[PDB]
Every structure is written in structure tokens, then in C-alpha cells.
């Protein structure tokens, strides 16, 4: 039966190299795994003992001094054409966007990483990186980088957290620094201290779109953290959600902070807090899943969502999780309801589909409510009954075409492993046009 070995890496950024997967997160923490199931913890905090950057407090002295911090926030490590590993590091004071972002380079994924210097700052009292006075209602906090190649081999970096929103910069593929003259770069969304951070871009060759993943809400147990996605034909936008809303329009109301209500309507919502547990039956359950990265396996065409999450009843404890992603008929990804255990999309038979399901509806809100299950039943006559009504059918090998309460959803049927109950389960995972995700798990 499947084996898991857990690690804690907040804000994990996935990278595959040398036949092995690594995640690099905040606090100079990191872990590795060969199979995305058994992880080995490598580092956990910023100290002069951390082997990724020896004597880190001297090596990145200028960043800690600017940011007035003893830690680092959410790193990204990306391999460039010279074969070397470039870590995009950043620190932030924490109570304000007083931050610096820089890059360090290593010959080997596990270090040592050598500082090349700071290249962006936020939170200055005067002139900012774009030649205008720094203003956090429109300018970024210089944290949460994702440095990536587009389908043509051009290098970009997307970044941002709260403050003025999410931005993208053209990067130098020889040095790892931004090309000159761009300021903070091009704005993709955001404004007025919206609760939106952790951008990540993944291309899908089959659908021919770039997917911009984001985290909405606050990270903590009462924060309503949830993972959302939008897409564009180009890496630098414009990005839209499944209803065709332009992501550029998303921001808080002028003169406010953390206006969740104005931003909720925008983006496809893939996953938020939920539990399959009931009084009578154990189940899986997350609180505030978010700050994701994503991986595309060119050998198989399979995609994976990698993220941290908290849990019902475990306070602020967090661990890394991985869920497989599937593109639906309209070119939007749905997440497997259970963590990755080596499952793949296979042929599904009608006999396997019929029966009773526990249903999670992730909705479109930012909410600290842990979503709970209701029970439905997929009938042999193609109706759905029980605590909701609708219809189901299958397209081809495993495509789920489901109607619930007069809304139409599309995704997949998928047999997988429930690691809490330690049983196989038939599931479905689907998405409607409003960007609402629904998961079914069969009883
Ligand atoms: Ca990240
Ligand atoms: Na420390
Ligand atoms: Na990377």
C-alpha cells in the first residue's frame, strides 16, 4: 500500500532535476523526493548552519538590513541554460512591504548558493524601482518570485504579494537579472492591498494556454486561503477566468485594505478548506491550502499541483501536499480530490460510477468555513438525486459531464487512494463556468 513521508516547507516551489524533485519555500526551507510521496526534509530555517547558503547572514547581509528581518520569504529556484541553479530570494519586514529581492547561484541543486546581488526593492521612503515615489497601493511588494521559461524559450519572472498586485518582468537568460528599463515590470492584476499572492505560471502544450495560479485570502487557519487559476495565450497576459473576466480588473476598492469582497468574483477557484470527515467516518481534510507551484511531465502529459496546507484541528501546523491536475473539455484544470499516490486517468465503466457519493462544493468565496459534505447518488438512469438533484454522463474514456442544481460541470472520473481510510475510492472532480469546483468521493 502507498507510503507517505511528510515534510514542512511553507510556500513550496517545485523543481525537477537529476531525476529528483525538490521544493524550496520560505525560511530557506527545502525537501526532496523521488516519487512525490516520500519526502526527505533538507533544511528548515535561516541560520548560519543552513547548508544551502553558508553564513547566510553575512552572504545576504544587504537584504536582511534593508528588510529589517531575520528570515527570508518564498524562494524560487530555476535552472538556466548554463546548467546552474538560480535561487530568487527575498525578505520582507512583515508589517509593511519593506522588502528586497535578489538572486544567488549554485553549481549544484543542494548548494552552496552564492549571492549575485539585490535587484528590486520595495517600501523605500522615496523614488521606487520605476522612477516614481513608492506607493504600495499600485506598486508590488517584491516577494514571491516564479522565474520560468515560456514555450519559445524566453525567460520571465512573475512575482508579488498583496500591496499593488502581481507583476511580470522579462529576464536575462545569461545573468538571471531582469532586462534593464522595466521598473517593476508589467502589471497582470491587483491593487489596494488585495489578499492575492504566490503567483505561478505553467504552460500546457495540449491546451495551448499559460495558467497563472494564485493564492487568495490569508495563509493562517482563519484566513480563508484558497488556490485559484486564470489563463492567457501569452505568458505576460492578459489573463482571464472561465467567465471571461479580465484579471487586470481585480483590485480592492480605493481607500481600503484587504477588501476580499471585491476580489472574490474573479478567478477559477480550484481548492479551499474542506473535510470529508463525518461523525461516523474518518476522512481527509485541509484548512487554508495554498501558495502552490505546479509541474508538467513532458514524458506523459501529466500535471501536478504542489502546495502547503494546514488541517482541521491542527492549528497552524502545515505540510507539503501534491494533487494531480486534469484538463477538462474547456481547457481548465481540475484537481484530484485525494493526494497523489501513483494514480492515473484510466478507462472507467458505468458500473464503477453508479452509487452514493460524499460531495464537496468549494464555491467561489474567500472563507474560513471548512466546507462539509452532503450526500448524492448517481443513478443508473443518469439522474442524480439525494441532497442535490441533476444528471450525469460520461464522454469517452473518463470524462465527467455533470449537472447539479441547474449548473453544468465538466471534468473527470478517477479511481484513487484515500490515505486516511486506506481504501480505494471512485471520485469525480469537475468545474463549471463560474469557476466553481465540485468533488465527489464514493461511499
Ligand atoms: Ca512561489
Ligand atoms: Na535565524
Ligand atoms: Na523554479
CATH number of the CATH domain containing 24: 2.115.10.20
CB 35 within 8 A of CB 374: no
State the DSSP H helix or E strand holding residue 227, giving kind and residue range, or none if neither: strand 226-232
> At which residue does the C-alpha cell 474514456 appear?
397
Sheet with strand 268-271: strands edge to edge: 196-204, 209-216, 226-232, 268-271
* DSSP character at residue 131: S
The reply to whether 11 belongs to the active site is: yes
Same domain, 68 and 193: yes
Do 154 and 48 fall within a single domain?
A: yes
Instruction: Taking the CA atoms of 387, 392, 284 and 364 in sequence, report the sign of the dihedral they define.
Output: negative
> Is the peptide bond preceding residue 305 cis, with omega within 30 degrees of 0?
no
363 and 239 in a common domain:
no
* Main-chain dihedrals φ then ψ at residue 27, nearest 5 degrees: 65, 25
Give me Rg for the CA atoms of the chain: 21
Buried/exposed code over 358-396 (b: 16+ C-beta within 10 A; e: otherwise): bbbbbbbbbbbebbebeebbbeeeeebeeebebebebee
- Cis peptide before 112, with omega less than 30 degrees from 0? yes
Helix or strand holding residue 261 (H, E):
helix 260-263
Examine the domain organization and report whether 116 and 159 are in the same domain: yes
- Based on the domain organization, do 171 and 210 belong to the same domain? yes
Rounded Cα gap, residues 173 and 157, in angstroms? 11
Q: What is the CATH number of the domain that holds 406?
A: 2.40.128.10
| For the CA of 12, the nearest ligand | 1
Q: Both 149 and 38 in a single domain?
A: yes
Q: Which of 305, 336, 367 corresponds to the end of one domain?
A: 336
Of 235, 192, 189, which is closest to residue 215 (Cα–Cα)? Answer: 189
357 and 268 within one domain = no
Phi, psi of 345 (to 5 degrees): -60, 130
**End-to-end Cα, the chain, rounded Å:** 20
Place of cell 464537496: 360
Is residue 14 a known part of a binding site? no
Other CB atoms within 10 A of residue 222 CB: 10
158 Cα–ligand 1 center, Å: 9
Q: Which of 422, 416, 430, 12 is nearest to 213 (CA)?
A: 12
- The active-site residue out of 59, 76, 170, 197 is 197
Range of the domain at 122: 12-336
Judge residue 355's burial from the number of C-beta atoms within 10 Å of its C-beta, 0-12 exposed, 13-18 middle, 19 or more buried. Answer: middle
Q: How far apart are CA 139 and CA 165, in angstroms?
A: 7
Q: Are 344 and 336 in contact (CB under 8 A)?
A: no
Q: Does 5 fall in a domain? A: no
3-state secondary structure 72-109: CCCCEEEECCCCCEEEEEEEECCCCCCEEEEEEEECCC
Domain final position from 302, 336, 370: 336
In a domain, 92, yes or no: yes
Q: In this structure, is residue 341 part of a structural domain?
A: no
User: 321 lies in a domain?
Assistant: yes
Cell, residue 261: 469582497
Q: Is residue 397 part of a domain?
A: yes
Distance (Å, whole) CA 284 – CA 186? 40
Q: Yes or no: say if 274 and 285 are a contact pair by the CB < 8 Å rule.
A: yes
Instruction: Measure CA 364 to chain center.
Output: 16
Residue 67: what are its φ and ψ, rounded to 5°? -80, -15
CA–CA separation, 289 and 343 (whole Å): 21
Residues 439 and 323 in one domain: no
Q: Indicate the DSSP class of residue 140.
A: P
**Options 11, 170, 236, 259, the catalytic residue:** 11
225 and 317 inside one domain: yes
Same domain, 163 and 294: yes
Q: What 3-state DSSP class applies to 273?
A: coil
Residue 321, Cβ neighbours under 10 Å: how many? 21
Strand partners for 365: none
Q: Considering the domain boundaries, does residue 343 fall inside one?
A: no
Taking every pair of C-alpha atoms in the chain, what is the biggest distance, in angstroms? 69
What Å distances lie between residue 70 and 45, 59, 160, 437, CA to CA?
Answer: 10, 13, 20, 39
Give the Cα separation of 261 and 267 in Å (integer).
13
Residues 301 and 391 in one domain: no
Taking the centre of ligand 2 as the mean of its atom positions, its distance from the CA of residue 327, in whole angstroms, is 42
Q: What's the resolution in A?
A: 1.9
Cell of 211: 495558467
Active site residue 297: no
Is residue 434 a part of any domain in this protein? yes
- As a whole number of angstroms, the distance between CA 390 and CA 430 comes to 14
Q: Could you tell me the distance, in angstroms and rounded to a whole number, from the CA of residue 388 to the centre of ligand 1?
A: 37
3-state DSSP of 411-436: EEEEEEEECCCCEEEEEEEEECCCCC
- Among 275, 303, 336, the domain-final residue is 336
Please count the CA atoms within 13 angstroms of the CA of 90 that sit on its side-chain side.
32
Structural domains counted in the chain:
2
320 and 379 inside one domain: no
Structural determination approach: X-ray
Q: What is the rounded distance in angstroms from the CA atom of residue 279 to the CA atom of residue 312?
A: 14
Specify if 292 maps to a domain.
yes
Q: Are 214 and 197 in contact (CB under 8 A)?
A: yes
Which H or E run contains 319?
A: strand 319-327
Amino acid at each position: 500500500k502507498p507510503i507517505f513521508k511528510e515534510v514542512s516547507v511553507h510556500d513550496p516551489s517545485i523543481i525537477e532535476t537529476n531525476g529528483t524533485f525538490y521544493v524550496f519555500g520560505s525560511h530557506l526551507a527545502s525537501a526532496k523526493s523521488n516519487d512525490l510521496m516520500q519526502w526527505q526534509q533538507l533544511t528548515t530555517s535561516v541560520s548560519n548552519d543552513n547548508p544551502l547558503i553558508p553564513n547566510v547572514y553575512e552572504e545576504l547581509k544587504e537584504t536582511f538590513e534593508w528588510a529589517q528581518s531575520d528570515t527570508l520569504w518564498a524562494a524560487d529556484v530555476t535552472q538556466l541554460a548554463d546548467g546552474k541553479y538560480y535561487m530568487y530570494y527575498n525578505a520582507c519586514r512583515g508589517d509593511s512591504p519593506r522588502s528586497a529581492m535578489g538572486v544567488a547561484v549554485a553549481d549544484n541543486i543542494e548548494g552552496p548558493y552564492k549571492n549575485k546581488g539585490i535587484f528590486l526593492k520595495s517600501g523605500m521612503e522615496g523614488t521606487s524601482s520605476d522612477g516614481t515615489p513608492y506607493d504600495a497601493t499600485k506598486h508590488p511588494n517584491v516577494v514571491d518570485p516564479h522565474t520560468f521559461f515560456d514555450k519559445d524559450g524566453k525567460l520571465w519572472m512573475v512575482y508579488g504579494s498583496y500591496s499593488g498586485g502581481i507583476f511580470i518582468l522579462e529576464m536575462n537568460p545569461k545573468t538571471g537579472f531582469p532586462l534593464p528599463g522595466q521598473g517593476y515590470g508589467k502589471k497582470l492584476l491587483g491593487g489596494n492591498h488585495s489578499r492575492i499572492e504566490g503567483p505561478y505560471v505553467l504552460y500546457n502544450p495540449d491546451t495551448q494556454y499559460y495558467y497563472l495560479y494564485l493564492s487568495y485570502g490569508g495563509l493562517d487557519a482563519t484566513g480563508g486561503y484558497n488556490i485559484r487559476v486564470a489563463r492567457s495565450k501569452k505568458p505576460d497576459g492578459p489573463y482571464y477566468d472561465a467567465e471571461g473576466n479580465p484579471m487586470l480588473d481585480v483590485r480592492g476598492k480605493g481607500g481600503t485594505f484587504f477588501d476580499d469582497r471585491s476580489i472574490e468574483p474573479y478567478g477559477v477557484k480550484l481548492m479551499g478548506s474542506y473535510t470529508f470527515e463525518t461523525e461516523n467516518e474518518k476522512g481527509t481534510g485541509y484548512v487554508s491550502p495554498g501558495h502552490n507551484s505546479a509541474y508538467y511531465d513532458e514524458k506523459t502529459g501529466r500535471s501536478y499541483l504542489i502546495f502547503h496546507t494546514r488541517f482541521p484541528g491542527r492549528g497552524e501546523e502545515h505540510e507539503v501536499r501534491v494533487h494531480q491536475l486534469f484538463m477538462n473539455k474547456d481547457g481548465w484544470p481540475v484537481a484530484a480530490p485525494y493526494r497523489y499516490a501513483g494514480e492515473t486517468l484510466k478507462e472507467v465503466k458505468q458500473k464503477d460510477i453508479t452509487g452514493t457519493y460524499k460531495l464537496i462544493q468549494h464555491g467561489k468565496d474567500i472563507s474560513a468555513d471548512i466546507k462539509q459534505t452532503i450526500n448524492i447518488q448517481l443513478n443508473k438512469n443518469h439522474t442524480i438525486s439525494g441532497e442535490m438533484t441533476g444528471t450525469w454522463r460520461k464522454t469517452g474514456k473518463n470524462t465527467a459531464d455533470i449537472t447539479l442544481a441547474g449548473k453544468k460541470y465538466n471534468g473527470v472520473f478517477l479511481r484513487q487512494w484515500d490515505s486516511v481510510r486506506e481504501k480505494n475510492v471512485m471520485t469525480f472532480s469537475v468545474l463549471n463556468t463560474s469557476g466553481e469546483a465540485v468533488w465527489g468521493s464514493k461511499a
